[PDB]
């Protein structure tokens, strides 16, 4: 469905994404998509936004992540949707 190559994509986060990334990882100008997915996953888990028991839904209406993605919640199974929400918060570099 999603190619493995997607995770090699180099990105420059927009300010609000960068702000979220900085609460879980070291700041730098450019990230891989692998890094962005890892750091956002860690952001979600540390802050207990993920309800794994009960439908694999992340609940983010009470959090900055909700502002980033424009949704009150989403399913962690919907990978293409997740990539699209992340993409709108960054600029791809070559
Ligand atoms: O399938 C999954 N089930 C749980 C994992 C993983 C999911 C995931 C992994 C690769 C690519 C995509 Cl698009 C993907 F969604 C991920 C992840 O590893 N990083 C991340 C980041 C955001 Cl913003 C949302 C969900 C996840 N989840 C973290 C759990 C704390 C919710």
UniProtKB/Swiss-Prot annotation:
Region feature (Necessary for interaction with USP2): 1-93
Entry comment describing in which tissues the protein is expressed: Ubiquitous. Isoform Mdm2-A, isoform Mdm2-B, isoform Mdm2-C, isoform Mdm2-D, isoform Mdm2-E, isoform Mdm2-F and isoform Mdm2-G are observed in a range of cancers but absent in normal tissues.
Subcellular location: Nucleus, Nucleoplasm; Cytoplasm; Nucleus, Nucleolus; Nucleus
Region of interest called Sufficient to promote the mitochondrial pathway of apoptosis, as start-end residue ranges on this chain: 1-84
Source organism, top-level taxon: Eukaryota
Consequence of changing residue 41 to A: No effect on its ability to induce apoptosis
Residue ranges of every copy of the SWIB/MDM2 domain listed in the record: 9-92
Triggers of expression: By DNA damage.
Post-translational modification: Phosphorylated at multiple sites near the RING domain by ATM upon DNA damage; this promotes its ubiquitination and degradation, preventing p53/TP53 degradation.
Disorder association: Seems to be amplified in certain tumors (including soft tissue sarcomas, osteosarcomas and gliomas). A higher frequency of splice variants lacking p53 binding domain sequences was found in late-stage and high-grade ovarian and bladder carcinomas. Four of the splice variants show loss of p53 binding. Lessel-Kubisch syndrome: An autosomal recessive progeroid syndrome characterized by short stature, pinched facial features, prematurely gray hair, scleroderma-like skin changes, small kidneys and consecutive kidney failure, followed by severe arterial hypertension.
Remaining remarks: MDM2 RING finger mutations that failed to ubiquitinate p53 in vitro did not target p53 for degradation when expressed in cells.
Assembly notes: Interacts with p53/TP53, TP73/p73, RBL5 and RP11. Binds specifically to RNA. Can interact with RB1, E1A-associated protein EP300 and the E2F1 transcription factor. Forms a ternary complex with p53/TP53 and WWOX. Interacts with CDKN2AIP, RFWD3, USP7, PYHIN1, and RBBP6. Interacts with ARRB1 and ARRB2. Interacts with PSMA3. Found in a trimeric complex with MDM2, MDM4 and USP2. Interacts with USP2 (via N-terminus and C-terminus). Interacts with MDM4. Part of a complex with MDM2, DAXX, RASSF1 and USP7. Part of a complex with DAXX, MDM2 and USP7. Interacts directly with DAXX and USP7.
Domain text: Region I is sufficient for binding p53 and inhibiting its G1 arrest and apoptosis functions. It also binds p73 and E2F1. Region II contains most of a central acidic region required for interaction with ribosomal protein L5 and a putative C4-type zinc finger. The RING finger domain which coordinates two molecules of zinc interacts specifically with RNA whether or not zinc is present and mediates the heterooligomerization with MDM4. It is also essential for its ubiquitin ligase E3 activity toward p53 and itself.
Function: E3 ubiquitin-protein ligase that mediates ubiquitination of p53/TP53, leading to its degradation by the proteasome. Inhibits p53/TP53- and p73/TP73-mediated cell cycle arrest and apoptosis by binding its transcriptional activation domain. Also acts as a ubiquitin ligase E3 toward itself and ARRB1. Permits the nuclear export of p53/TP53. Promotes proteasome-dependent ubiquitin-independent degradation of retinoblastoma RB1 protein. Inhibits DAXX-mediated apoptosis by inducing its ubiquitination and degradation. Component of the TRIM28/KAP1-MDM2-p53/TP53 complex involved in stabilizing p53/TP53.
Family of this protein: Belongs to the MDM2/MDM4 family.
Protein name: E3 ubiquitin-protein ligase Mdm2
Source species of the chain: Homo sapiens (Human)
Encoding gene per record: MDM2
Covered range of the whole protein: 18 to 111 of 491
């Amino acid at each position: 469905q999603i190619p493995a190559s997607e995770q090699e994509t180099l990105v420059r986060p927009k300010p609000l994404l960068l702000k979220l990334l900085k609460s879980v990882g070291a700041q730098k100008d450019t990230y891989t998509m692998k890094e962005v997915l890892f750091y956002l996953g860690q952001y979600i888990m540390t802050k207990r936004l993920y309800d794994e028991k009960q439908q694999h839904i992340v609940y983010c209406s009470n959090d900055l992540l909700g502002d980033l993605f424009g949704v009150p919640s989403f399913s962690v199974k919907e990978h293409r949707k997740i990539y699209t929400m992340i993409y709108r918060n960054l600029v791809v570099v070559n």
